Write a protein that holds these residues in place. Structure first.
Motif, PDB file in Angstrom:
ATOM      1  N   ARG A 111     -30.005   9.890  -9.242  1.00 43.93           N
ATOM      2  CA  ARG A 111     -31.093  10.566  -8.702  1.00 43.93           C
ATOM      3  C   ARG A 111     -30.736  11.767  -7.781  1.00 43.93           C
ATOM      4  O   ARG A 111     -31.473  12.747  -7.750  1.00 43.93           O
ATOM      5  N   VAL A 112     -29.567  11.623  -7.079  1.00 40.03           N
ATOM      6  CA  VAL A 112     -29.141  12.740  -6.263  1.00 40.03           C
ATOM      7  C   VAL A 112     -28.449  13.797  -6.976  1.00 40.03           C
ATOM      8  O   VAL A 112     -28.647  14.987  -6.839  1.00 40.03           O
ATOM      9  N   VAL A 159      -2.535   8.542  -0.651  1.00 40.18           N
ATOM     10  CA  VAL A 159      -1.653   9.475  -1.245  1.00 40.18           C
ATOM     11  C   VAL A 159      -2.252  10.305  -2.359  1.00 40.18           C
ATOM     12  O   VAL A 159      -2.234  11.555  -2.266  1.00 40.18           O
ATOM     13  N   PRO A 186      -0.070  10.107  -9.048  1.00 41.05           N
ATOM     14  CA  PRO A 186       0.386   8.717  -8.849  1.00 41.05           C
ATOM     15  C   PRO A 186      -0.638   7.810  -9.576  1.00 41.05           C
ATOM     16  O   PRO A 186      -1.415   8.279 -10.424  1.00 41.05           O
ATOM     17  N   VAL A 187      -0.627   6.517  -9.235  1.00 43.21           N
ATOM     18  CA  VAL A 187      -1.534   5.574  -9.827  1.00 43.21           C
ATOM     19  C   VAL A 187      -1.918   4.649  -8.714  1.00 43.21           C
ATOM     20  O   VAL A 187      -1.108   4.352  -7.850  1.00 43.21           O
ATOM     21  N   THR A 209       0.925  -1.122   0.000  1.00 40.65           N
ATOM     22  CA  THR A 209       0.000   0.000   0.000  1.00 40.65           C
ATOM     23  C   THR A 209       0.965   1.170   0.000  1.00 40.65           C
ATOM     24  O   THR A 209       2.094   0.912  -0.369  1.00 40.65           O
ATOM     25  N   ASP A 210       0.620   2.372   0.264  1.00 40.02           N
ATOM     26  CA  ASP A 210      -0.417   3.151  -0.252  1.00 40.02           C
ATOM     27  C   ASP A 210      -0.034   3.758  -1.637  1.00 40.02           C
ATOM     28  O   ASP A 210       1.135   3.960  -1.943  1.00 40.02           O
ATOM     29  N   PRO A 264     -18.461  -0.411  -1.240  1.00 38.25           N
ATOM     30  CA  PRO A 264     -19.272   0.496  -0.382  1.00 38.25           C
ATOM     31  C   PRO A 264     -18.665   1.852  -0.332  1.00 38.25           C
ATOM     32  O   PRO A 264     -17.566   2.134  -0.758  1.00 38.25           O
ATOM     33  N   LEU A 265     -19.458   2.797   0.109  1.00 37.26           N
ATOM     34  CA  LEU A 265     -19.102   4.183   0.124  1.00 37.26           C
ATOM     35  C   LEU A 265     -19.347   4.937   1.382  1.00 37.26           C
ATOM     36  O   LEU A 265     -20.076   4.528   2.313  1.00 37.26           O
ATOM     37  N   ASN A 297     -29.677   5.702  -7.265  1.00 37.56           N
ATOM     38  CA  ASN A 297     -29.781   6.720  -6.253  1.00 37.56           C
ATOM     39  C   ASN A 297     -28.804   7.863  -6.388  1.00 37.56           C
ATOM     40  O   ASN A 297     -29.191   9.012  -6.276  1.00 37.56           O
TER      41      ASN A 297
END
Lengths: 255, 255, 255, 255, 255, 255
Positions: free
Chosen positions: D87-88, D15, D30-31, D10-11, D42-43, D84
């Motif tokens: 829709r938002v 970053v 970066p990538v 990681t990271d 999920p968010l 959704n």
């Protein structure tokens, strides 16, 4: 034997500790009756600093300093603790006085150790007894070793130790009333009269005098420790000015 | 259950450190002993940073900065740590002088290393008898390998190291006096008289002269190191204006 | 077998970092080794960002910036990451040069790969050997696959990569001669002379160059990048004025 | 399976993200590649909120807004969520437009479904198929039930979906020539000419189209949207003043 | 069987408590049931502090102070607690009085104990009845032992106790007219009218008087407890002045 | 098997709630669902407080207070919770009315009960039916016992209960044409025109009024609710004057 439910109670020490640090001349009145924990009692640095502060400001013909110490010495405390506590709060000069006094208190325990070879602190056979060396920390595993002192001494002896200590403390703390803080309060040319008046008024609020003797003291500081031309400005004020507030007004009039 | 309850004891160590790090002018009288712990004792960086602040500012010209190293060097830790602390605090030139002093110090261990094998940093059998290379860190498993030094060295070797190092430090912290921060204190249009004065008072407080030398030194930085019209203004100031306070008052009077 | 008791010793790594950000001029010299660890390092975002901040701010024209980038390439890490880091710091154009330079740098490793196969970035028999496509992440399971690159590369190759990169970096950071962020400091009506000047003093704090060039350069830039009527005011200023502070004083006199 | 390594290498995520939220025009380069996690993704709101803030302000007349969406829609997403999200951000009227556009996109998936069944978003045997109703979220157990959609879908279909969604978006992110929030900006007697000028400088900062057009617009927003008496002031101003700064200075001249 | 599902359902007690502490004037109507939990309750210091604040401020015959006291005496507690609490809120003299009243109450339970020797809090063996020593905490093992009182007294008896206690509070809380704090609101030269008036207005908001009696009482306080010269200013004041606001305006006019 | 992997899915609800409570008039549009969770939801205090604040300020003049109430009554809850919610938000007069209205609703279940004795809330025989006393929470064990209600009610029954409750509320929340708290805000001498304008801007932002009715009302609020002597100052203001801003300017002209 352990463990016992829940824990815990209300806590009154927690409550107590709060009420006191929460409007202290309003007075914390709830009883605080602590048992258990180890043989001996842990310590809190916070209590010490705020005690240092009190020992600085009031000293220790104050019954706040006395009250806060008393409460702190309900504890079964190790010799190393007593040593540190005392050497810390008293500092060089009075610590010697205390050290000596305290030595008499131990001496009086060797009397009761001899009168009663088997009193609470005491053992039940000839070696097991509470002895000079135990009490002076000179026994093997005590000297240079507080854990060993803790591993060797019994709670009854720790309480006896702490009373002896409290005693020797009460015996020593009766010296040098003449105040105090106030004496280092001089108006800065850096400072406003009002900032000074407030710093001083804070100290006076913090004095133990009858209110009626406060104001003569305050006026004396105003007269003596403000700024010379301002002192002279006060010299032109009437005698019809009779409280610091009237005087404060007289200054406020001119700015 | 077991072993060593709670862990362990109480709270002098903590209280010391607390109290020190609290209103420092007069602080921290409790005795603190700290047995045991790992064979060696991982560092406290904050205590070390602020040491660097002291070492910067005052340095070793206080026996508070010195006092604080002493305390920090009650620790048994590895030649890598000694190195990393010393290179950093001394800076190249004095690190080099120390290095040499420290080798000398180590040379005196090679006498006590031969003379005696009973000592904590020495062994009895020939392969247990401590070698130069270990003591110099130039031993296999030592160079480029603190984990190896940690893995090879006994506690007795750390205290010995620590002792040669502290000695070699005491031996170098004799050098230098002439004060010091002051030399950078000069007033710009970037700051007012009040700002400069405060900056100066704070420094003044930090100087080690008895009070009797302070006014003449303050007065001197003022006359020459105030702003040019203000140095002149100080040249118009009456000689009768004698303490810094009066002279400050003379500046206070005119804007 | 395994793992690592305690863990751990001093810190020296975080202590290093700490010191630098704790009085930047001359700080932070202990030795830092970091012993053993991920040899397949997964970096830290904050450490890159503050580097980013320096690359942005100062750039890369600094033997301190270059130093901190060196320090961050002490790590054994993956080419993909070397690429992202370089793309972000170098910016698109030099990044491209670097990318080429790095390929040349990498080409010279195919010489030491063919010459020797004992070395950590290689294996003994023909397949055991580390191929070019593998070294470049260009072999199967590495292309579009940093984890797969991590599964296919071994630690020595990563150090090699890093060295080639690090060289390739140095071959590119020879950089400009104009300085600096300063060039866009110009007084608007959005800001006072004092603010402008202070913004200029910040930039002057950022001029590392000969102390001796700073005041003629400052007087010139102040003359030229100040507000126009102020410029003309400076056009009226005394030649006898020798520093910005004198010049500030001159402005300080008029409003 | 495992044990895992560790999790995990990681990271560049943080970053990446960090750099963008640390000065947007100081491009993050970066990538970041991603796998895994459950079927889908999920968010958390921070990105959704900050996107809403973008969507309000520039929306999707920024190719950074379009970009921040493109990147969030690199993700394998469940249709309800998508629905959704759209829709938002779109709001009922364009949401409709999208809906219609997406439906066409969904039609185009039935094309690649009719042509072939070998795709990740389809089964090989006829029973294995990813039917229309299913594609529509409206198969048995999908109806009203995103956990059922999640229990019936496959990852290949989330990609398919995300493309259908994303495509329909891009065709529709065609939108407004006009700009922008700026248009509601008009000075109140609530705010100063400077508060208005800094606020208009925010509007300008948000007006990314040629700089050369910014100043005429700026000055016009002064001429017509400054307070009336200030407009009248601007009428007295000469066309010789040619920047807002020059004009700001004229104002500054007058009080 | 046991312990609790999930644990557990929630929480009109929290909601109640929230609302009260949320713009106190008109709030807090949910029913709050809460058994189970401990056998009897260890309180929470916070409620006590805020009650101590109300006991200070308002004092204790308010319809809200009484309301929070009832609530705090809605669950079983030890005699020890009750004691400490009553001793803190009542203060020694009214506490002593309280004891007296409480004793009458305790006698009245020895009637319900004689009348029904087999009442739910009472004994169900023989001499293990609800006796005066139990009720007093002086039964064997309750003697100087709050834990022993908590382990020997039954919950029914604690509730019985809590009612007697509460009764004796109701019986005592029938005294005290004073209003109160108010008597110490004066205007020293340490405060402006505006600070004083605000302090006073807060104290008037906290009055129980009808609003219509509040203004004559403030108007008198304004006339009588302002700074003397401010009182002379009030002395010149029109008879047509008829509110504090009109008075405030009147002062506002003069500086 | 089971029971709930991962946790968890998207969010869509907390996010929803955030967006709403972050951009209120730029309303959140995701669909939100949350199966599964508890059998019946036992409230959230923060969320009740913020509804309480809306219920204080606007109440049911905003279809936001309803919205938030609807969301909060979108899952099955206890009669005791419902009762507690209603008695707290409606307060005594509208609560009584709602009890009545709710009672009607409970009657309509004894119809739907009579028509279908085995509908969702019901069970096989009569005792598995939802009798009136169950519906009233006055069935044996529910009776003053919310735990008993939780132990005795099924979800199918709570959702009939919750609907009925919400229904009688929709029915009740009609009353009050008048607008709004505003009728109690007037200027004092305690705070100025700018602060009155601030209050006024708040009332305006809180108006639901068509924008076109806001200037008559606002001006009315100025003529009628500002300081009288200011209303008089305002009486001289030109009849041409059309907005608060021109009035604000007029006052500024005199400042």
């Amino acid at each position: 034997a352990g463990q016992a439910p829940g824990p815990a109670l209300t806590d009154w020490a927690r409550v107590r500790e709060e009420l006191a640090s929460t409007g202290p001349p309003v007075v914390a009145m709830p009883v605080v009756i602590k048992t258990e924990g180890p043989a001996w009692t842990p310590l809190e640095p916070k209590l010490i600093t705020r005690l240092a502060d009190t020992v600085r400001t009031k000293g220790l013909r104050s019954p706040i300093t006395m009250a806060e110490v008393e409460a702190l010495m309900s504890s079964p405390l190790l010799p190393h603790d007593v040593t540190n506590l005392m050497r810390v709060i008293l500092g060089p000069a009075p610590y010697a006085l205390w050290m000596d006094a305290w030595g008499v208190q131990l001496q009086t325990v060797i009397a009761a150790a001899t009168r009663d070879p088997r009193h609470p602190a005491n053992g039940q056979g000839r070696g097991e007894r509470t002895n000079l060396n135990r009490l002076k920390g000179l026994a093997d595993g005590m000297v240079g070793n507080p854990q060993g002192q803790a591993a060797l001494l019994r709670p009854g002896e720790l309480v006896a130790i702490t009373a002896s200590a409290l005693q020797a403390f009460r015996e020593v703390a009766r010296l040098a009333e003449p105040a105090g803080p106030w004496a280092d309060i001089m108006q800065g040319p850096s400072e406003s009269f009002v900032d000074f008046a407030n710093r001083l008024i804070k100290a006076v609020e913090g004095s133990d005098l009858p209110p009626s003797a406060r104001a003569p003291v305050i006026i004396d500081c105003f007269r003596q420790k403000s700024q010379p031309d301002i002192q002279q400005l006060i010299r032109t004020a009437p005698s019809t000015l009779t409280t610091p507030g009237e005087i404060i007004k007289y200054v406020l009039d001119r700015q």
